[PDB]
Paper text:
In the gene cluster containing the lin1839 gene, the [name] gene encodes a putative glycoside hydrolase family (GH) 3 β-glucosidase (BGL) (GenBank accession number: CAC97071.1). The structure showed that Lin1840r forms a dimer of identical subunits each composed of three domains. The active center of Lin1840r is located at the interface of domains 1 and 2 as in the cases of known GH3 BGLs.
In order to understand the recognition mechanism of Sop2 and Lam2, the complex structures with these disaccharides were determined using the nucleophile [name] mutant of Lin1840r. The electron density of Sop2 was clearly observed in the [name] structure on soaking in 100 mM Sop2 and fitted only with the β-anomer. The Glc moieties of both Sop2 and Lam2 at subsite −1 are located at almost the same positions as the ligands in WT-inhibitors complexes despite the replacement of the catalytic nucleophile with alanine. The reducing end Glc moieties of Sop2 and Lam2 are consistently stacked on Trp271 and Tyr583, and form four hydrogen bonds with Arg572, suggesting that these three residues constitute subsite +1. The fact that Tyr583 and Arg572 are derived from a loop in the adjacent subunit indicates the participation of both subunits in formation of the catalytic pocket. Sop2 complex is also considered as Michaelis complex in spite of its conformation, since Sop2 is not superimposed with glucophenylimidazole (PheGlcIm) known as a transition-like analog in HvExoI but with ligands known as Michaelis complex, such as 2',4'-dinitrophenyl-2-deoxy-2-fluro-β-d-cellobioside (Cel2F-DNP) in GH5 Bacillus agaradhaerens endo-β-1,4-glucanase (BaCel5A), a retaining enzyme. In the Sop2 and Lam2 complexes, the angles defined by the oxygen atom of the glycosidic bond, the anomeric carbon atoms in the ligands, and the carboxyl group in the catalytic nucleophile are 165° and 164°, respectively, as in the case of GlcNAc-MurNAc in a nucleophile mutant of GH3 B. subtillus N-acetyl-β-d-glucosaminidase and Cel2F-DNP in BaCel5A. The distances between the catalytic nucleophile and the anomeric carbon at subsite −1 are 3.2 Å and 3.0 Å, respectively, and the distances between the catalytic acid-base and oxygen atoms of the glycosidic bond are 3.4 Å and 3.2 Å, respectively. The anomeric hydroxy group of reducing end glucosides in Sop2 is exposed to the solvent, in the vicinity of Asp91.
Numbering used by the authors:
A (entry chain A), B (entry chain B): 1 to 724
The structure:
């Protein structure tokens, strides 16, 4: 409906109606829900919620199905005085019912279109079950694999994260200005603003601290890119930002998000974060929490009651302007209008059962394709892989038969629809003998059974991994290792004298040195989702050819953290030339290098790259155009990820040794050759200075073209002169 | 001499003379040295140094003895045109020839007077060998025991560090305005400005980053306290501070150090740090390095040549003001005048051999006393300790006979004068049987020998530890554990069925859970210095009673780092109540608590404390006066460390759960009772806000009185009203 009519609604609402519009609740706190009704009475009483609250609530969080939504919405519109529909929001993180790989695995794809497709299918399915908003993408930069939430990020590089962030928004939303018409697309909500990934010691919800310049340089760019691409909502973070909980941080949310980033949508709190500023010790009570959160421009309080119980008295007593409340309500109403809820509150569902769109075979093919783009081949000694379909396989370990392959942050997908490793392999391989072991134990009996199976077969597929519950939210590990029983299992299998491929399933970087040394091949599958076993079988048999690259560094050991490719040089860098000396930046007990670096991954193919002549000089403001010819010089079709990095050799701030500024994943048949071109705009050459200005300085840059952050040719470009 | 005459010298100097005044060199780069003279020609050529450079150099770094000094200074004053004497500077970190405990161990003393004495004796001896300046105290706050340089800090608390930092300045300098008369005292140089201890991943020289507010709140206060107490010099740090290498950080060194902290002495570079800004990528070349370092106010370049080879051209071309040079030269001359060098350039030595004053028995008694104050008794199950002098002792392990007990940063002390553990024990105990093992191995032959010795005796003294070379500068360990052979040794010794005391010698916090669990008692000796074996024997026999408390947290495991007592609460704290739930700040695999906390330490005595009635309310600006009565309720004389912490419950910045604000180490005879009083001024109640103002806010504080950061009684005080 027209804007005038939206403003009209705001004027017509009572104060109590406006306050409750800023509250989000679980579905079973509403009448008309069709699940968990036994939770409703107790919990309404505990939150001290009344009908006047729930009949005017603004939003539902985590509806369980289309029927739940329809029922809740129908009952609510019966009794709502002005006919304002609820908006329904959900966590669709890496798929709805068709589960795609976890985001960190999608990071390893280096493939924008893979990520857009995941987001499209997610929305197709989620809208079919009546969800309007997804709490994705998660764009927290991560340098610390202790933190369980790395699984939800695309990794340690802001440029990659920004690019795949944009891809996800485009896939969920399509043309954002048509979300009232395109009812198979949904609103995206960027999270968690800001810098949540820098949690001290990888500990969940823990202190975050960095300079404002670093915040702007590394931690903000990905949220900013997704906002500029049209993300409709933003969610606050649990952590402090320079000492102030993000949720009531007026500088962060008013000056930066609403001011500088020009964000004019709904700012929704993370779960309970408005009430938690009390625990943080920056509000005395819920009256203060409410006041400060509203000052900071939080429109929507998720599942706490600070707003509903305190706003009235704050507005009555004059501590808080009613104008701040009206602008929140107006943003909530504009969101609903943007989704077409005032013309169709059932968002396409009321006379249209869209069950048919959920968990289709076409969608499964897409998740499989996503799986095979995202996996990373870390070792393959002696061309052990791909296996022949006649290879006789002993398939052993805790991930042999585990149905736990869908990943963390899988709120709607079901393990029964998932394909485990055994099932996947037996579709492809005629002889498989299986010995499943426990996640945290290695018994004598297991060793006997494993030994017997390996004696029978020709090659071992050792399937190791984490339970998904060892990561995700509030799954912090001080030591980033598998249970020791799995390292013992790999050591045992090695002694049997048969070639061993390790297929590793996990949600974070781990200490894998002992796995690489105990096997001939090592494949990082992460958690591929619904098609897990087929993803694995096709990569092992060569039906698909591994093409993923690490989007996060794999530490030598836990105490190397944080280690990441885009690091500063320091004043005493270790060089090939000073190897050995005491007074240089090094550890006495490990290498400075991570075990595996950013952008690293193997292939069954072999490629050669050639960069065309680059200029020696460039004007300020000028783009550098980078042409690369790549040839598949093997007999196997495959894909390579061309990566381009820039370094600022001398600057007024000590700049990273490399930063990724472009990438493209190129598919090549045997013998095929292609040319791709990149444009590094003058923004790629810029950075934040000690004064927090985005600047471009004259001087020397190096340009790295290659297939990892380490496997590169280097070129020099002197920037100066006049500005374009 | 008169200030006017000092100025006169500056006017009389040529440009080349002024430039060279800002250079510091090793002694064997001068004519007249009496050691390492064969290094002189090659190195002079490599640095491309001439006589005109060395005959006008401003300072000598690391003279080897009084004779080296006298010789160098005598030859130099022969040829120097205006008669400006050299100033001689050295690393006297925890003693000269009489070696005291490493600073981190001195932290654990919680004893201001112990620290002042160490500093007094250090200066007595160092001045006797002709040094004018010491590069101490090191006041870098440390939260990361991977970093080898934690040994040189007093630990994780800014208040403790500030207080002992002041004690060290007073001990070295005495009345700073009389350093021309008191020739047994010497100038102190505060280091490393600033925040060097926050090196990322505990990696030497590595990136430092934190908000400016945190910089002020936690990282600056100890340098500031030592500057205000009258420290004559400051040394720059190796690291970046918000992206700019400290050495050329104009904001840091001009605005903060010279402006806000009102420091008007010599700013000396850390070793090579002026040249190393090039490596950091914030200067293109040595011409830029010089220009920027001088702009930032660095007066004295340590052992690099940027200044001498580039200042002339910078001044000639007008890229740098000659006035900046003259003020550096004037600060250098004022330092020399403060030390009386213009009346006596040999600073008391020329007709007075003070060999007499070095390594006296009185001094040894003081280092022993320091040792016994600083050790920390971590476990003592079943009153194993103290041992009777008739106890028959198996003394085993790598520290049984090792002479490596003087600590890191022992530039002048000699192992032959040290007392090892065996020697110390046999002065006290009639029966000791010794089995020495290696630091990194545990052989079958060792086990047989250990077994035989333990069977013969009644109690095991298991002496475990680090070589000093595993810490100090550029001794970063990614995993903070002893060599695994020592853990295996402790496990083996435990199976022998005899009571075990572990005496642990080390320069950092270590993972000691496996030691505490494998023994009945555990004594943390750190590196006590020259009197090590006697420090150990006296504590073991009860001749002295352990009284140290930890000045740094001991992590459950490496991946808990950083862990520290003064932490933020977060938005989802673990409580007694919610412990068990998923969605709280916790690790899946370890406790949140460190293994041992700040301020923790045992005693052979037992004490009780009672805090007198506190007010319920306080005005802004008002001091809180805290009276504590402590009684020794045992039959053993000993010392307790009374600690007082404050918390700011609610603030505009999320404030730590506790901060130490006072402490006193109280000595009590059996049955004795004392009353001590503390004043927590309104500055103890203050903090830096989001705008970097030092503020006091009205509201609730809690006051904790006790004997650790955990063992405390808690009291509430409501601050508000008017201001004093
Ligand atoms: O689910 C919406 C957003 O909120 C958080 O998940 C909450 C968690 O913080 C809370 O403790 C539990 C209690 O039931 O529910 C979860 O829903 C996540 O941190 C957000 O990413 C999520 O989008
Ligand atoms: O000793 C003067 C100051 O120098 C640094 O020590 C240097 C070290 O950086 C350099 O690598 C070696 C070269 O041999 O000399 C050492 O003396 C220390 O970090 C400062 O704390 C010290 O006060
Ligand atoms: Mg540059
Ligand atoms: Mg307060």
């Amino acid at each position: 409906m027209e804007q005038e009519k939206v403003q009209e609604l705001v004027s017509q609402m009572t104060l109590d109606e406006k306050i409750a519009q800023c509250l989000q609740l679980s579905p079973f706190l509403f009448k008309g829900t069709n699940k968990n009704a036994e939770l409703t009475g107790p919990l309404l009483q505990e939150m001290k919620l009344t009908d006047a609250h729930t009949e005017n609530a603004g939003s539902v969080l985590g509806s369980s199905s289309a029927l739940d939504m329809i029922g809740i919405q129908e009952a609510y519109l019966k009794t709502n005085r002005l006919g304002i529909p609820l908006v329904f929001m959900a966590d669709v993180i890496h798929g709805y019912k068709t589960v795609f790989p976890i985001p960190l695995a999608l990071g390893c794809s280096f493939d924008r279109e893979t990520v857009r497709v995941m987001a499209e299918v997610s929305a197709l399915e989620a809208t079919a079950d009546g969800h309007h908003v997804t709490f994705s993408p998660m764009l927290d930069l991560v340098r610390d694999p202790r933190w369980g939430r790395v699984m939800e990020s695309t990794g340690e590089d802001p440029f990659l994260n920004s690019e795949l962030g944009k891809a996800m928004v485009d896939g969920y939303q399509g043309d954002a200005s048509k979300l009232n018409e395109n009812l198979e697309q949904m609103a995206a909500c960027v999270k968690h603003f800001a810098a949540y990934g820098a949690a001290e010691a990888g500990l969940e919800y823990n202190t975050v601290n960095m300079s404002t310049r670093e915040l702007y340089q590394n931690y903000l760019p990905a949220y900013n890119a997704a906002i500029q691409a049209g993300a409709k909502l933003v969610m606050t973070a649990f952590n402090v930002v320079d000492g102030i909980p993000a949720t009531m941080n007026k500088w962060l949310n008013r000056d930066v998000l609403r001011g500088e980033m020009e964000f004019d949508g709904v700012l929704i709190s993370a779960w309970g974060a408005v009430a938690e500023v009390i625990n943080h010790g920056t509000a005395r009570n819920p009256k203060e929490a409410a006041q400060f959160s509203m000052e900071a421009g939080v429109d929507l309080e998720m599942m706490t009651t600070c707003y509903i119980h305190e706003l009235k008295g704050l507005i009555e007593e004059g501590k808080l302007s009613e104008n701040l409340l009206d602008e929140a309500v107006l943003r909530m109403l504009n969101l609903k209008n943007d989704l077409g809820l005032f013309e169709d509150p059932y968002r396409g569902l009321k006379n249209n059962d869209r069950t048919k769109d959920i968990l289709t075979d076409e969608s499964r093919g897409k998740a499989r394709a996503a799986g095979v783009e995202s996996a990373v081949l870390l070792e393959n000694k002696s061309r052990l892989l791909p296996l022949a379909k006649e290879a006789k396989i002993a398939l052993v370990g805790p991930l042999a038969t585990s149905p736990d392959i869908l990943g963390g942050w899988n709120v709607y997908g079901e393990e029964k629809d998932g394909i485990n490793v055994e099932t996947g392999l037996r579709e492809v391989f005629e002889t498989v003998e299986v010995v499943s072991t426990e996640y945290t134990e290695l018994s004598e009996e297991d060793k006997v059974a494993v030994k017997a199976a390996v004696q029978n077969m020709d090659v071992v597929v050792l399937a190791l991994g984490e339970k998904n519950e060892w990561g995700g939210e509030a799954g912090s590990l001080a030591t980033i290792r598998l249970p020791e029983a799995q390292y013992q299992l790999a050591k045992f299998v090695q002694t049997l004298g048969k070639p061993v491929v390790i297929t590793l399933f996990n949600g974070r970087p781990l200490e894998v040195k002992e796995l690489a040394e105990s096997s001939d091949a090592l494949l990082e599958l992460w958690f591929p989702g619904t098609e897990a076993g087929r993803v694995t079988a096709d990569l092992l048999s060569g039906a698909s050819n591994p093409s993923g690259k690490l989007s996060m560094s794999f530490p030598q050991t836990t105490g190397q953290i944080p280690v990441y490719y885009n690091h500063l040089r320091t004043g005493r860098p270790q060089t090939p030339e000073n190897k050995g000396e005491r007074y240089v930046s090094h550890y006495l007990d490990i290498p400075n290098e991570p075990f595996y670096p950013f952008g690293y991954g193997k292939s069954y193919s072999e490629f050669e790259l050639k960069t065309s002549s680059l200029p020696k000089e460039l004007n300020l403001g000028e783009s550098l155009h980078v042409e690369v010819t790549i040839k598949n010089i093997s007999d196997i079709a495959g894909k390579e990820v061309i990566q381009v990095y820039l370094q600022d050799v001398t600057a007024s701030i000590s700049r990273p040794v490399k930063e990724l500024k472009a990438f493209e994943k190129v598919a090549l048949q045997a013998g095929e050759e292609k040319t791709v071109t990149f444009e590094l705009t003058s923004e790629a050459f810029s950075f934040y200075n000690h004064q927090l200005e985005k600047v471009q300085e004259p001087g020397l840059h190096r340009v790295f073209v290659g297939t990892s952050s380490e496997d590169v040719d280097v070129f020099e470009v002197e920037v100066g002169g006049y500005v374009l």
